[PDB]
Ligand binder design. Structure first.
Ligand SMILES: OC[C@H]1O[C@@](CO)(O[C@H]2O[C@H](CO)[C@@H](O)[C@H](O)[C@H]2O)[C@@H](O)[C@@H]1O
Ligand code: NAG
Ligand code: NAG
Lengths: 108, 124
């Protein structure tokens, strides 16, 4: 009932773009993004929704809703990328919540 | 929850601030955009406020609490203008144009664009 993507950047100075589309009849009660600097709530409206996700905590300013990736993490397969990630929890009016993983690999 | 006068004062300033930034960006990058693509970006501004209203309220409530006095509508005007300014929406405009991802302009977007900012629905 929800679709989403993340569009990752090639440099830590440019934030990633999270884009979701909500198609629903059970309503969506809450959406919470679990970021390295805290839990950020959003309200996914009918159709398209958008959010910026910063790669570094050095991009935080005194402003609402900023979200920093957890990471960077090394991955086991190779040493030419690192992983940045957040998760999202979607609480529906009925049934169990939906848990989403939002991942960006950054070349090194 | 929030008194209607305070909600309107917020929304008018947030949308005003986002729209100012888009006009500036369009002066440089709008030449090759279609009319509906420009309208899509105006909708992006209104929808961004809707999507983030929950975390706006968290930040606003902390600022209002810090007043140490009963708030007035001017306090919310001020905070709404700060929210409208303290973000570079060009990260979206640039990304959407550069990657040919400006959303298809659909009627639910036109409906929001035709509203007065004071009337744009938000959820708490
Ligand atoms: O724990 C989050 C809490 O922090 C506040 C202000 O103290 O907002 C800051 O932290 C948020 C992370 O969750 C950021 O999203 C926000 O940009 C930053 O100001 C509150 O708004 C929030 O409840
Ligand atoms: C965020 O998720 C991590 C696991 O990825 C978890 O340890 C933490 O409890 C979560 N934060 C909150 C505020 O629930
Ligand atoms: C390195 O590992 C990451 C994650 O497993 C993967 O996305 C990427 O394609 C890998 N790179 C190469 C060159 O295999």
């Amino acid at each position: 009932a929800a679709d989403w993507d993340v569009y990752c950047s090639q440099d830590e100075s440019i934030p990633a773009k999270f884009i979701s589309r909500l198609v629903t009849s059970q309503a969506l009660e809450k959406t919470e993004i679990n970021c390295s600097n805290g839990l950020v709530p959003i309200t996914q409206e009918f159709g398209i929704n958008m959010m910026l996700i910063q790669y570094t905590r050095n991009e935080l300013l005194d402003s609402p809703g900023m979200c920093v990736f957890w990471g960077p993490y090394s991955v086991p397969k190779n040493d030419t990328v690192v992983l940045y990630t957040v998760t999202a929890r979607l609480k529906w009016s009925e049934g169990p919540p939906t848990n989403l993983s939002i991942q960006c690999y950054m070349p090194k | 929850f929030l008194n209607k006068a305070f909600e309107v004062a917020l929304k008018v300033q947030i949308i005003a601030g986002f729209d100012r930034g888009l006009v500036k960006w369009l002066r440089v990058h709008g030449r090759t955009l279609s009319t509906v693509q420009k309208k899509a970006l105006y909708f992006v501004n209104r929808r961004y406020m809707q999507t983030h209203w929950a975390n706006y309220m968290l930040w606003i409530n902390k600022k209002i609490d810090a007043l140490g006095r009963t708030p007035v509508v001017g306090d919310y005007t001020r905070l709404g203008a700060e929210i409208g300014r303290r973000i570079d929406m060009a990260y979206f405009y640039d990304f959407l144009k550069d990657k040919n991802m400006i959303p298809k302009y659909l009627p639910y977007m036109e409906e929001i664009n035709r509203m007065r900012p004071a009337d744009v629905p938000v959820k708490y």
